[PDB]
Amino acid sequence: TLVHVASVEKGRSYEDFQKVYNAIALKLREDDEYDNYIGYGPVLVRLAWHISGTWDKHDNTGGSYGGTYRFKKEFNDPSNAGLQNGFKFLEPIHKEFPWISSGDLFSLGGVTAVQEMQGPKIPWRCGRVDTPEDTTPDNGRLPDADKDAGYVRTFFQRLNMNDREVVALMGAHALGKTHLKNSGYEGPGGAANNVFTNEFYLNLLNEDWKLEKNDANNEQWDSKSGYMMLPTDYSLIQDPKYLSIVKEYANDQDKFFKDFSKAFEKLLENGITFPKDAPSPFIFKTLEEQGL
Ligand code: HEM
């Protein structure tokens, strides 16, 4: 059995990690022009998810622990196209705090982004330890977007995620946009795409979606308001179990925030054993909370 035990970066405590959080958050505030003024928040969230989403619950391969996205096999994964922008953003942060592990930095990037975009607090635990190049998972473990609800359900079960967790996690698609050159899909999902809200669910239910081909010859669902949904997004209103949960989050952002926060922490922690002596999860203050 392959076990990854969280090991606190030697001599570091909450306050050290809050400094890393603050550095990420200050750079997010500064680099506001990225991606036609969306900023780096969305791509940092996606990065944190993609480095975690290689996990296989069956044998504990992949996952966030080893920081293996730093190795070319994984950063050149076609599924990861575009995330190099997030990695470059993080580079000066890692230079300022060389003591932090790669897995901790990439996951913390995602937590910082959600919180600074006015999303829920996400508790975060340190202790991921870099592992060598030969532990890098092969490409092909991240999901396709052209598929239906059955595929989504099956895919997420490899990450030990159930229906509620799947629907909550997908609400992160409120953020950012699809880019044709990265994924073969093009367009934003709504108007509020650098503030964390339940817009994904509202738009799914309330927009008039038309199935169209895009300029890469892939099918996607497009609205007259200039928004789109991936086939896997749209599957959440096709499957009856998913649809019920989509309605719940559309009606109650607070519930969405609570369930997202739990699911996102779990996603970022899959594969990691936290010893009983480990620090409690950290809840970082926002820059606003600190007057910074
Ligand atoms: C069935 C599962 C999923 C599929 C098929 C999927 C697919 C995609 C695709 C195709 C893109 C566009 C990438 C690009 O063109 O730049 C995207 C973007 C994004 N994904 Fe997902 N995704 C899934 C789940 C998730 C999850 C679980 C999260 C995080 C909790 C997430 C967060 C994001 C974010 C924040 C973006 C915007 C990135 C940006 O604007 O640069 N996705 N996703």
Ligand SMILES: NCc1ccccc1
């Ligand atoms: N619903 C369109 C979408 C998908 C992924 C990321 C942003 C927006």
